[PDB]
Design a protein around this nucleic acid. Structure first.
Ligand SMILES: [Mg+2]
Ligand SMILES: [Mg+2]
Ligand SMILES: [Mg+2]
Ligand SMILES: [Mg+2]
Ligand SMILES: [Mg+2]
Ligand SMILES: [Mg+2]
Ligand SMILES: [Mg+2]
Ligand SMILES: [Zn+2]
Ligand SMILES: [Zn+2]
Lengths: 385, 424
DNA sequence: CAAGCGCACCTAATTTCCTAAATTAGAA
DNA sequence: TTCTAATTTAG
RNA sequence: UUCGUCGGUUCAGCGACGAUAAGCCGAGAAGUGCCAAUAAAACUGUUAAGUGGUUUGGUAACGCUCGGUAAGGUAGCCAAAAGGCUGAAACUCCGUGCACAAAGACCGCACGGACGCUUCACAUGUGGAGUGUGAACGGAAAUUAGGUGCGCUUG
């Protein structure tokens, strides 16, 4: 429902960077003071204070802390200060049992404390020129008069890539702006705006035009890829190789000095057990992405990572579990699913695939999985020749 | 003029109690130790806040002799914690509280400034001990009995132990010589600890002793340089002899790569695993990685020991009395060393303390263009960076390994000032 | 794969520390 | 009555 | 000719052993989440209204909490019963003592020899020393910085 995205700050719109930085550092100092004093006031409120300290008219911890710290930290806006106090007292109340028991000393806050912003204090807008603008109301009433900074401090953010969709939804009206924060990173020496967007998620429904292509990789066991989304899932069969080495060496040892009958049962049972966990995971990734259909090669060894696995059992179990979950399964002929590119489509080292006609580079197993994920790949492969 | 070292001693069995009762005693005392540490830190932080408020209001700082009733926070913390921690012995509790209050006092400004958070102490805190509460006696039949004083008087009545809790420890190897020297009188025991090793489920007695190192006669005008080279892990060179000693890393990063690969592989298997790995908690879901808990660290600890002892022994063999090395602080030094993710700080610390034992002074110098300076001439030119592998001095026709030249330049006394005068 | 949030688990780098004198109390 | 472990705090 | 347990500590070998251990199971409710009821601090606005989301009890999916699970070898008799005697078993061999009846706890220690073996020395040998599989043996806590894994969200 509530998730956050980061937007780097380019420049203040109406103020030089020096005044903006001075204001931000002063407000960071006030925020850290508010957090520490609120933690100490919460300590006093709960009754943890020692005997000598005592040798309140409010209702909750937050009210008393906010009213006490309101005087000294007058530069911060009332809403931002209240959010900071709530953060402090909520961190104290969660760790309350540990502090009393003695499993934790005291909550502490760093020097580069992010500043807070309530929903009704951060406003974002676009421009005809395309420059994305955000408006922040940080200072209180006396602070604006003291610093001669009127209106709200307009800023310019970087809105590109996967962040443009979120911002477009925010400005369109679908998403809403929740409580946000200003974040400073010392290393990169840049500021950020943690705009938290509020939205109603939609329950995914299986669509037959969403495919989860599947291939047996040479580096991993199975690589799952989709063409509608760049999400990727892989089954790294490390335990399979560990068990293979264990069984081979045990058979070598027991050869020297009925005995191996137990080994034959253990190998067969482990394959069935492994084929159940793999099938459950494979289908459960089609459900999460809503892939209404699954495309997998139908089944020599072919130098797959599972050197001598029982592929037919895995395919049958995948088919059965997909039928249970309302997922159709297709069997695509794997002629050149690995050699063909996933973007250019030119059908021209082992681990990393290359597209000499386009320069695209990715994992070879992922490339083959994506090629399989393309609908009706058999026909376009035939026509490609 | 006195060093301090430690040695471990595995505890076999409780001499008079059973292993179950002894384990319960140890767990309860661990809980008391952790509680005391956290409470001492809490009281220190509260007193800091009260002092600041008092200075702001009344105009002057409050003297602890009036408000607290004790001179320092250690005394007040002992007077407070001892009621709820009546199972630890008085000396051990006082030592623990002093450790906590000394850690808070050392970094008080950083705590107020915000660079350092308030210290918090973990679950498996080692038990503390002092020299007055540890005594070791050896029987005629080759057994070492450690009479530990771990409990308080109220705890003695409740736990039904009317004397010092005694344990039997294995004292072999160099541990045998250390214990014999302690009993004879050469080594004086200091505050010690009890630690638990989860991998082997073994308790250890961590005796820390004080001793006078054997300081020989070594002139200060014989200097050995050390460079964490690009090809060889550590290259050693001298100015008076053309002697070169190398420590090429036959096995350095392979161990870390293997352990990290295995850990990542088994961690990613939590999504598709058996039915008994999910549904029982975080510790059980991450159970398979407990085999790789300390393989990377322990391998490097032994590897850094082997390198350091070899380095120190070479200094004695050539008769040196000074070891100059690099100042890697803030990663200002060369970013391309043969070791990739090694713990250079641990290697440097080991070299420092072993040299101090061997009566050798270690001096750190700031490196600037050290791999490019010509030892024979002194011309600071950057044109000899041939992959940081072969050094060819054009101005002198000198060809040699870059690591040897770097170590030789570090071996020149006051190399930092010489460089600063040469180019700045 | 990329970018955020939450949680915890691993490495390294850096620092401080590794009391003790005096008094009391219980057992011989 | 002597004495050796605990116990308390100064610095 | 893979992982792991024991053989004093770390790394490596060796001897025995165990492994589907990247496996199996149990209890419970501090958290994430789900179900139900209730709606505090604070802010803007006269007030009305809005933003904000607080407290309590349930269920039991969880990288939810607490946990349990395999791994070296060892000698019997006497008395009715307590106890007594003999002295087996782990990283070279022998002798003499001390200590050991079931062990999470015992398989060890000291002295004298042999046999290897690491240093040194004096003339391939000879003699001192350490040495018993090889190397090593200054750790603990905390903070800081980075990385990783899992879950969620967007592309
Ligand atoms: Mg997605
Ligand atoms: Mg014994
Ligand atoms: Mg055992
Ligand atoms: Mg070992
Ligand atoms: Mg025997
Ligand atoms: Mg001998
Ligand atoms: Mg050994
Ligand atoms: Zn292409
Ligand atoms: Zn030159």
């Amino acid at each position: 429902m509530i998730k956050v995205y980061r937007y780097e700050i380019v420049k203040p719109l109406d103020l030089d960077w020096k005044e903006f930085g001075t204001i931000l550092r002063q407000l960071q100092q006030e925020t850290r003071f508010a957090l520490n004093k609120a933690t100490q006031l919460a300590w006093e409120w709960m009754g943890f204070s020692s005997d000598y300290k005592d040798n309140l008219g409010y209702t909750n911890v937050h009210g008393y802390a906010y009213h006490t710290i309101k005087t000294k930290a007058y530069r911060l806006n009332s809403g931002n200060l209240s959010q900071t106090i709530k953060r402090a007292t909520d961190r104290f109340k969660a760790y309350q049992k540990e502090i009393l028991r003695g499993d934790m000393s005291i909550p502490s806050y760093k020097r580069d404390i992010p500043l807070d912003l309530i929903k009704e204090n951060i406003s974002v807008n676009r421009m005809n020129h395309g420059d994305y603008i955000a408006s922040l109301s940080l200072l209180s009433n006396p602070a604006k008069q003291e610093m001669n900074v009127k209106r709200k401090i307009s800023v310019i953010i970087i809105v590109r890539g996967a962040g443009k969709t979120i911002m477009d939804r925010i400005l369109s009206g679908e998403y809403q702006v929740s409580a946000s924060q200003i974040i400073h990173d010392d290393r990169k020496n840049k500021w950020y705006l943690n705009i938290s967007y509020d939205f109603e998620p939609q329950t995914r429904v299986l669509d037959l035009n969403k495919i989860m292509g599947i291939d047996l990789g040479v580096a991993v066991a199975v690589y799952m890829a989709f063409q509608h989304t760049p999400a990727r899932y892989k089954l790294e069969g490390g335990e399979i190789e560990n068990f293979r080495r264990q069984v081979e060496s045990r058979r070598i040892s027991m050869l020297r000095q009925k005995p191996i009958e137990q080994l034959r049962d253990k190998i067969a049972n482990f394959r069935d057990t492994t084929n159940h966990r793999y099938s459950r995971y494979i289908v459960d990734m089609a459900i999460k992405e809503g892939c209404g259909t699954i495309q997998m090669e139908d089944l020599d060894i072919g130098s797959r990572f599972l050197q001598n696995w029982t592929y037919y059992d895995l395919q049958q179990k995948i088919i059965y579990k997909a039928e249970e979950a309302g997922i159709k399964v297709i069997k695509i002929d794997p002629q050149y699913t690995s050699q063909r590119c996933s973007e250019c489509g030119n059908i021209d080292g082992q681990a990393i695939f290359k597209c000499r006609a386009c320069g695209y580079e990715a994992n070879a197993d992922y490339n083959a999985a994506r090629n399989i994920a393309i609908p009706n790949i058999d026909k376009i492969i035939a026509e490609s020749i």
